[PDB]
Amino acid sequence: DEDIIAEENIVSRSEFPESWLWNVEDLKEPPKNGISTKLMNIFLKDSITTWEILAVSMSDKKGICVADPFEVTVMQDFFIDLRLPYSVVRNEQVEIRAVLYNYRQNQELKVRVELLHNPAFCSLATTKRRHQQTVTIPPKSSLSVPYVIVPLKTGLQEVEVKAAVYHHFISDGVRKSLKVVPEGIRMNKTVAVRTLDPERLGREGVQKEDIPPADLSDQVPDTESETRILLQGTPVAQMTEDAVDAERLKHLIVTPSGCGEENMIGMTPTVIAVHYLDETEQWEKFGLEKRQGALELIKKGYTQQLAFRQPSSAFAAFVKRAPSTWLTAYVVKVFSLAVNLIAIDSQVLCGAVKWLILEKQDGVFQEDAPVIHQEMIGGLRNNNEKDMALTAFVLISLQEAKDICEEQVNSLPGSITKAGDFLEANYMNLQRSYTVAIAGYALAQMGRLKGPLLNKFLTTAKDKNRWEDPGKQLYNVEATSYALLALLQLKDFDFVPPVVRWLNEQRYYGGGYGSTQATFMVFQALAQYQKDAPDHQELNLDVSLQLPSRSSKITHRIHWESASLLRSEETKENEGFTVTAEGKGQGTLSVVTMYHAKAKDQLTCNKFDLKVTIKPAPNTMILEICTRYRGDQDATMSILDISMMTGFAPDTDDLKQLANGVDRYISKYELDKAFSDRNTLIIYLDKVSHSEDDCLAFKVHQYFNVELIQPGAVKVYAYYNLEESCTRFYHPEKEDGKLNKLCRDELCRCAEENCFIQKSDDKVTLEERLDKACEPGVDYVYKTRLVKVQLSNDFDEYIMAIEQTIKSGSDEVQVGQQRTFISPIKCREALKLEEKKHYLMWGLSSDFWGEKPNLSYIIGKDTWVEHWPEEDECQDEENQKQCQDLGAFTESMVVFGCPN
C-alpha cells in the first residue's frame, strides 16, 4: 500500500544461536605494565537478548584465568517475538503467536503484520492472497497476533512473519525453524538380548547368533526406523586369597647366631619374611622404617656365613668338618633368593654351584657328610627315597641360581639335564607324597612334568588340596608348599585355590624347632602366589557383525581396558542379521529398534476435557467454554488461554461479571484494555472440577469485518505443567474449528485457496476460453449436468454426469458416467450449483482425489466452472452471446482441438 515498506524489501532476522563466538585469540600486542590489550571486531547475531561472553586465558608464566562474564544486551524500539514450540505433530492444527513489541516512550504505531505463505504448511496465507492484519500498538506496550497453521510434511520446517509500520521507516522480520514430527508415538522394541561366550556357548571356538527383524506391525506409514546394535563387555574380577597378615610375621625377625648350620637357621626366617613382605607390599602396616634393620640382619647373617666357607667354596658346620651337600645347596638356595635384598658375591654362589655339580655324582647327588642339625632339612629326614628327594632339593637350588651362575659355570645346564633325566626316569613308583611333590616341582621348572607323571602328581594329592603323608605336619606343609609352587609353574589355576586355602587354614606362621624348611617354602610359595597375579580373567573378544545391506564386515575388538564401553552400530533398514563372536571372555549383545507406533489412545487432551462452542446470540455471538480435569482429585489453579476470531472482541460487562469472585480472576491489565486490539485474553481459574464440566460463557462482538475469519482458540492447562494441556478451535461459519483440508493415509493437502476461477473483473470472450482451455496445464474439459448435491459437514460433494467429453486427459471417463466434484462448504454459496443444470468445467490433473476406481475431482483455484444455459434460455437474446461462445467453444475444441 501507501507509506509503508513492502514485504519483499524486508530482510527477516534469522540468526538465533544459543551460543557462538567459539574463537581463539592470542595476546601478542606490546605489553603495558604486563597487560596486553586486544581489540576484536565481532558481528552480533539477530537475537534480541543479553549475551554473556566468557573468557579464559592460559599463559606459560601466569597459568589459567577465568575472566568475569561480560554482558552485552541487544535491542530495538520495535520488534517481533515469534514464539515457536520445540516440535509440532504432522497434520495437527496448531496456533502460534507472534508478539509485536513497541518500546517507544510516547508513540503509538499503526502496524501491518503478515504471515508468509509456505507450501509445507496450511494456513489462510496462499500463493495468491496474503495473510495481513493492521493493528495499533500503544506506546510502551505489546500486542499478540495469533496464526493458525497445519504442518503438512515432517522435518525441519520454516515459519516466517514480517511487519511494517505506516508513515515511518520501521520494519522487522522473523524467520525461525521448528521440527515436524510423525503422528505416532516414540516407541522402541527390545529385539534381542544375547549372552556372548564363545569359549562356553560356541562351537569350535566360534559363536553365531541370528537376529530377527523387528515386528513393526503397528508402524506409522511412511516413517523411518533406527535399529541399534549394542555390544558391551562383561568384566569379571578374578578372586585372590588374602595374603597372611604382616603382624603375624613380627616374630620372623631374628638375630642370626651360631655356627655353619645355626646361622642359616637364624637367617632363613628373616630372609623369607622380607621376601614375603616385599612382594605382598605390607611394609605399611608392619612399619616402613623397620625394613632397614631387617636388611641389616640379613647382611649380618651373610657375613657370618662367609666365615664357614671352606677353600673348596663349600659349606660345613665347622671348618674342619667335611662339607655337606644339602647344606651347601641350601646356602645356594637362600643366597640366590637374597640377591634382591643385599650384596651377594657371585664367586661364592657360583663356586658353591660348580662344587655341587661335580660332586653331585649317573648324575645324581650323594650327601657324603650329613648335616648336624637333622631337624632343619624337613621332609628329607626320612630314610626312604634319599636320592630322589635330595636330587629335587639340590636341583631346585641350581635352577634358582641358574640366571646368576650360568655365565661362569658352564657345566650347569647339562647337569640340570642329567638330574632331570634321572628324575624323569624314576618318578613313577616313588609313592611318598613329599617326594612326589618336591620332584614334581623339580620337574615342572623344566616343563618335563606331563602325561602319566603329571597324572600321578595330581592324583597323589589327597582331598584335592594337600600333599599328605603319615608323620610330622611340617613335612606336609613343606610338601604342599612345593606342590603349590609347582601349580604356579604349570599355570594350573583351577587347582590352586583349594591348595592355597588349605595352606592358609593351617595358620602356620613359621618359626620354632626345626621350622627352617617349612618356614622358607610356605612363604616362598605364598609370595609366588601373590606374584603370579590372576586378578582379572583375560578378556579379548572378537565380534563381527554381518548386515545384508552392508557390503563389507563390521568388526569389534572388546578388550579389558574398555570393557564397559558401549559399542553402538545403527541401521535404518529393518534387517535380520548375523553376529559371530570368538575369543576369551564374556559379553552382552542388545538389539533395540526405535520406530514410530500408531496410537489408539489419544496423544492430545490426556489430562483435560475441553468443549468450545460459538453460537449466534439472540453481529454478536456467544462463546461457551466447558472444561474438566481428568484426574482423581480436582485440578489446582489453572489457565484458560483464549484467542479471538479475526475481527472479534469480548464484551466488557460480561468479563467484569466473570471476574467477581466465583473462583475466577481476570487481571486489571485485561479489563483496562480498549475494545480495539484486545484479541487475546487469559481467564484464570482457582480450580477446575474433575467430577463434572465447569462451564463459563461470554459474548463476543464483531468490531472489524473481514472476508476470511481465522478460527479462534482456547487452551486449558494447570499452572504447574504447560505440556499437559488441551486446545480447541472455534469458527462461526460451519466448522469444528479446523481449517479446510483433504487428508488421506497421513497425506494432507491444503484447501484454503479460491473457490474457483472468477471471471468477475471484466468479461469473457471466445478467444479467452479457447486460449485458457488449450494450455497444457488444463487436463480435462467437460460438459456436465448436476445430478446430485450431497451436503456434508466438511465438504460438499457434487455428483455430475459427464454429458460430453470435450477434452479428455488422465481420466478415461466415458459419456454417461458420473464423477464427484469436491469443494469446501464455504464455497457452496459462491458456486451456486443447482441440480438439473448444466456447466462447462475444466481443470488440472493436480485436482485428482485419489485413485482410478473411485476417482473424484477437487474444485480448486484453477478450476473453471461456468453455467451452461439451457436451449430455451438460449432462445433469449440476452443469453445469446454466452450461447454462441459456448457452442463455438464446443465445436472448435471437439473438431479442431489445440494447435500447439
Binding site: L27, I64, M637, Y719
Partner: protein, 637 residues
C-alpha cells in the same frame, strides 16, 4: 655435633617439581651434600640425583630441586637419601600419582537432541601452569555408561584442548557427563555435567528473592518473598505469578498446598508472604523448634499477559534458624602453648553460608576481648593461657547489639596442650596481624619465643618454611639476638601465595640433659582469591547506545602478554533454564585448596605433629623425625 636435618613434603607428586631443604646446624666450613631419590623398596632405579654445597655464607642451609619421572591399589613410596660428608640421612616418603589438574568447559549448560557439544579441556599442573600430557576423555550417559572414549595429547596446545561431541537425534534425556583423566593417573578423574533436554529459550528471567537470607522461627511476619521478572533485553515484565512454598528436611520435600498464592506482577515485581500460621498448620508438628535445622524452598511460575511465554524459577536452602549468625572454629588451631597467648580466628557466617561483616564476637567471661569480623567474616581473639596440661575449652558468642541473647550465636571448641620434648617447657608461637591480605603487600610475621634463661642465648636463628598449593614456595632464616622475646619477619607477598599458604618455623638446640631438642610452630594464612595475572573483557568502542541485531561491535580484551585466550558467547535464556556446572575461577581455587596436603590451621600435639599436619616430613641425623604418613587423603573419611 653438626646436626644434619632434611625436610621434604608429606607427599611427593610425579612429573612435578619438588624442593628439598637441607640444614647443617652447628657446623663450620663447607659441607658437600648429595641428594638421591630411589624407588621403594627395590631401589631398582635412581629416580633423582642432585648436588649442592653448604657454605657458611649461606648459613649452612641449602636446597635441592628435583622432579621424579613417571616410571612404569596399595600406596607407593620412595626413599629420599641425602648425604652430607660422612653422614647419610634417609627418609621414606609417600607418593601421589596425581599429575596435575584438568578443567572442563562446555559452551552451554543444556542442549537439545541434535545439537553439538563444544568443550575445552584445560590441562595444568599443581602450579596451575599449562603442560603437555596425554589425556583420556569419556562421554557418559545419565545411566553411567560410557558411549565414547578418546585419547588425545595436550602437547603444543598451550594447555588448552578443543573438542566436540555431536548429540544424536534419538537420545536419552537427563544429566550427561564428560569425564577426563591424565593417562598416568586414572584414579584422578575430573568431571563436568551437561543437561540434555527438549526445550525452547524463554524471553525473560524470574528471580525469587526472600527478604532475609533465612527465617527466624519466632517471626510472626513469616517468610516474605519478592518476585522479580524482567526480559533478557532489560525491559520489565507485566504478568501473573503463581507462588508456592515447601519444607525441606535433608532430601525429603514436603509441599505446602495451603501456601499457594496468585499475585499480579506489576512493573516486573510482586510480593508474596508465607504466613507462620500456614507453615505450622502444614506440618503435623506443633513444636516449631523441630523445624530448626530444616530449610524452606520457594517455587514461582510467571506467565506473561500474552500467555506466549512462561518461566518457572526456584529458591531453596532457606534455613529455619534461631540465630542470624553461625560461629566456626575451622580456621583456629586446636593446639595451644601453655603459658603463651592463644589466638583464635573466629569465622562467623550467615545461615546460607556467606561471610558476615562487622559482627561483634567475644569469649565467655572475657568481655574485654571483644573483636569485630572483617570483610571475610573473620575476627581475631587473643586470650592468655596459664601454664597447665589441662585441655583449654573455649566458648565464643556473638555480641551484636539490637539482638537479644536468645538469638546470639554461640559455639564451643577445645584445644590440647602442645607436648614438649622431655617436659622442657620450650615453646614457640607464631602470630600474624589478621587482615585481608593481597599480593603486592608485606606481612609482619611475629616470632615469639618462650624458654628458660639457661639456654635462651643459644637460640640465634629460626628456620621458616612456606607451603603453597602443596609444595614449598620459599624457605629461609630469621636472625634472633639473645634477650629478644619477639622478632618480626617482613614477608613480601606476591601472587605465588594465592590462594593461601602455611608458614611453619622451628628452632633447635642442645639443652637440659645434653639432649637435642626441636621446637616447631605453624600458622595458616589466607590470601585474597584471584587470578595469577588478569583478564578483563569490556566494550571496545564508544558507549552507551545499545547495539542492534547484526551490528558490528568491537571487543576490548586485556590480559597477560603472550597468553592464549578462548572465548564463548551464550544467550542468557540458557541460564534461565540451567545455570549449573559453569566454570569459574572460584571453583578452580576450590579444587586447588581441596587438594592441599595440609590438614590443620596450625601447630600440632608435638614438634613432629606440626610438620606432619602442615604437610611436611622432618628428619634429623640425631634421630629426631616425623612419623610416617600412609594416607593420601587428610583425616577424616
Amino acid at each position: 655435633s653438626p646436626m644434619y636435618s632434611i625436610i621434604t613434603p608429606n607427599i611427593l607428586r610425579l612429573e612435578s617439581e619438588e624442593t628439598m631443604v637441607l640444614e647443617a646446624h652447628d657446623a663450620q666450613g663447607d659441607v658437600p651434600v648429595t641428594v638421591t631419590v630411589h624407588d621403594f623398596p627395590g631401589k631398582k632405579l635412581v629416580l633423582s640425583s642432585e648436588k649442592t654445597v653448604l657454605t657458611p655464607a649461606t648459613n649452612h642451609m641449602g636446597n635441592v630441586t628435583f622432579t621424579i619421572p613417571a616410571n612404569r591399589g596399595r600406596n607407593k613410596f620412595v626413599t629420599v637419601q641425602a648425604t652430607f660428608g660422612t653422614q647419610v640421612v634417609e627418609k621414606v616418603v609417600l607418593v601421589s600419582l596425581q599429575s596435575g589438574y584438568l578443567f572442563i568447559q562446555t559452551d552451554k549448560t543444556i542442549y537439545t537432541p541434535g545439537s553439538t557439544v563444544l568443550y575445552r579441556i584445560f590441562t595444568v599442573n599443581h602450579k596451575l601452569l599449562p603442560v603437555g600430557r596425554t589425556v583420556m576423555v569419556n562421554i557418559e550417559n545419565p545411566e553411567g555408561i560410557p558411549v565414547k572414549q578418546d585419547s588425545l595429547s595436550s602437547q603444543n596446545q598451550l594447555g588448552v584442548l578443543p573438542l566436540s561431541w555431536d548429540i544424536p537425534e534419538l537420545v536419552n534425556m537427563g544429566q550427561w557427563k564428560i569425564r577426563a583423566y591424565y593417562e598416568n593417573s586414572p584414579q584422578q578423574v575430573f568431571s563436568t555435567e551437561f543437561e540434555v533436554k527438549e526445550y525452547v529459550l524463554p524471553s525473560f528471567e524470574v528471580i525469587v528473592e526472600p527478604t532475609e537470607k533465612f527465617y527466624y522461627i519466632y517471626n510472626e511476619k513469616g517468610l516474605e518473598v519478592t518476585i522479580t521478572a524482567r526480559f533478557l533485553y532489560g525491559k520489565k515484565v507485566e504478568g501473573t505469578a503463581f507462588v508456592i512454598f515447601g519444607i525441606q528436611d535433608g532430601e525429603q520435600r514436603i509441599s505446602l498446598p495451603e501456601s499457594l498464592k496468585r499475585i499480579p506482577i506489576e512493573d516486573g515485581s510482586g510480593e508474596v508472604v508465607l504466613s507462620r500460621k500456614v507453615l505450622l498448620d502444614g506440618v503435623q508438628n506443633p513444636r516449631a523448634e523441630d523445624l530448626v535445622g530444616k530449610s524452606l524452598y520457594v517455587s514461582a511460575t510467571v506467565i506473561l499477559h500474552s500467555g506466549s511465554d512462561m518461566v518457572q524459577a526456584e529458591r531453596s536452602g532457606i534455613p529455619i534458624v534461631t540465630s542470624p549468625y553461625q560461629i566456626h572454629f575451622t580456621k583456629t588451631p586446636k593446639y595451644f602453648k601453655p603459658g603463651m597467648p592463644f589466638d583464635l580466628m573466629v569465622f562467623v557466617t550467615n545461615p546460607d553460608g556467606s561471610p558476615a561483616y562487622r559482627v561483634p564476637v567475644a569469649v565467655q567471661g572475657e568481655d574485654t576481648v571483644q573483636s569485630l569480623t572483617q570483610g571475610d567474616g573473620v575476627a581475631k581473639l587473643s586470650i592468655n593461657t596459664h601454664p597447665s596440661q589441662k585441655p583449654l575449652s573455649i566458648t565464643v558468642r556473638t555480641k551484636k547489639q539490637e539482638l537479644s541473647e536468645a538469638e546470639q550465636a554461640t559455639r564451643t571448641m577445645q584445644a590440647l596442650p602442645y607436648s614438649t620434648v622431655g617436659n622442657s617447657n620450650n615453646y614457640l608461637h607464631l602470630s600474624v596481624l589478621r587482615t585481608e591480605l593481597r599480593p603486592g603487600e608485606t606481612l609482619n610475621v611475629n616470632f615469639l619465643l618462650r624458654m628458660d634463661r639457661a639456654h635462651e642465648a643459644k637460640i640465634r636463628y629460626y628456620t621458616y618454611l612456606i607451603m603453597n598449593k602443596g609444595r614449598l614456595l620459599k624457605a629461609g632464616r630469621q636472625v634472633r639476638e639473645p634477650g629478644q622475646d619477639l622478632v618480626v619477619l617482613p614477608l613480601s607477598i606476591t601472587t605465588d601465595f594465592i590462594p593461601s599458604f602455611r608458614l611453619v618455623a622451628y628452632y633447635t638446640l642442645i639443652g637440659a640433659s645434653g639432649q637435642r631438642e626441636v621446637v616447631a610452630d605453624s600458622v595458616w594464612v589466607d590470601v585474597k582469591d584471584s587470578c595469577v595475572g588478569s583478564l578483563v573483557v569490556k566494550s571496545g568502542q564508544s558507549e552507551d547506545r545499545q547495539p542492534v541485531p547484526g551490528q558490528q561491535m568491537t571487543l576490548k580484551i586485556e590480559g597477560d602478554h603472550g597468553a592464549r585466550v578462548v572465548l564463548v558467547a551464550v544467550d542468557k535464556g540458557v541460564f534461565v533454564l540451567n545455570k549449573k556446572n559453569k566454570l569459574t575461577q572460584s571453583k578452580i581455587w576450590d579444587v586447588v585448596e581441596k587438594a592441599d596436603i595440609g590438614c590443620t590451621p596450625g601447630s600440632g600435639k608435638d614438634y613432629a605433629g606440626v610438620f606432619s599436619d602442615a604437610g611436611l616430613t622432618f628428619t634429623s641425623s640425631s634421630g629426631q623425625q616425623t612419623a610416617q604418613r600412609a594416607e593420601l587423603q587428610c583425616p577424616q573419611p
